[PDB]
Design a protein around this nucleic acid. Structure first.
Lengths: 85, 45, 80
DNA sequence: AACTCACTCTCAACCACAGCTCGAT
DNA sequence: TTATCGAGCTGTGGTTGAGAGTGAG
């Protein structure tokens, strides 16, 4: 589906994430493609809400990190901040 | 938790409302872009 | 680098509430997706490993999703 | 069954800038 | 407490080659 991240990009990333001898079913690739795509939606809606409450029109990087923190993803926040520099 | 359930439910209801058609929201910015010099599609002065 | 920002941005903009998006947001998001894909894939792998298998299958991803609270929002996606 | 990799052809990235955005004040 | 306003920032879209998609082996 054209509403999802491209499956080749997703597949590559799961492959590099696994021991060299691992195999990944076509079904598993399609399931994870949807999931990471939904991750973007999920987080964006919380960031989008924050901006509404605070009456701004731009979703920025901090809005994403706030949204990820209140949705259970604080563990990402550290690495992310460190990656921007 | 009770707070997570609220946000998760809101995320699911926002699902029915995803609009993937190309929507234009700064109709002025179309105008300037539409009538703007291009080298090979790229903008130029 | 990895994931195409345009397609990240397009998923963002399917939400009618979002208006402007900062230049760094899709950049940040693409990294966050890599951390997400990694965690979801490794936890799926765990289940496959526990069942003496080398091919991650869909039910492995489902197993990871059921077991991990952060992945609670995707529980209705697995089953069709 | 998934992986390989050569082949096809889609589509993400590129650019400038008018005037909107938003935090130091 | 809420409002200001200029230094910065971002949406817009034709074109095309980088790389997504494909499938026989």
């Amino acid at each position: 589906q054209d509403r999802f991240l491209p499956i080749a990009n997703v597949s590559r990333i799961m492959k590099r994430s696994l021991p060299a001898n691992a195999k990944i079913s076509k079904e598993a690739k399609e399931t994870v493609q949807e999931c990471v795509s939904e991750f973007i939606s999920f987080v964006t809606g919380e960031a989008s809400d924050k901006c509404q409450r605070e009456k701004r029109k731009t979703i920025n990087g901090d809005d994403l990190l706030w949204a990820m923190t209140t949705l259970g993803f604080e563990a990402y926040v550290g690495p992310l901040k460190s990656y921007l520099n | 938790s009770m707070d997570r359930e609220a946000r998760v439910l809101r995320y699911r209801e926002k699902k029915k409302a995803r609009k993937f058609e190309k929507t234009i929201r700064y109709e002025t910015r179309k105008a300037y872009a539409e009538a703007r010099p291009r080298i090979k599609g790229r903008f130029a002065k | 680098h990895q994931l195409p920002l345009a397609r990240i941005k397009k998923i963002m903009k399917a939400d009618e509430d979002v208006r402007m998006i900062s230049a760094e947001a899709p950049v940040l998001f693409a990294k966050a997706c890599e951390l997400f894909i990694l965690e979801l894939t490794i936890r799926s792998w765990l289940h496959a490993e526990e069942n003496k298998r080398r091919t991650l299958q869909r039910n492995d991803v489902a197993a990871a999703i059921a077991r991990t609270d952060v992945f609670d929002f995707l529980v209705d996606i697995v089953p069709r």
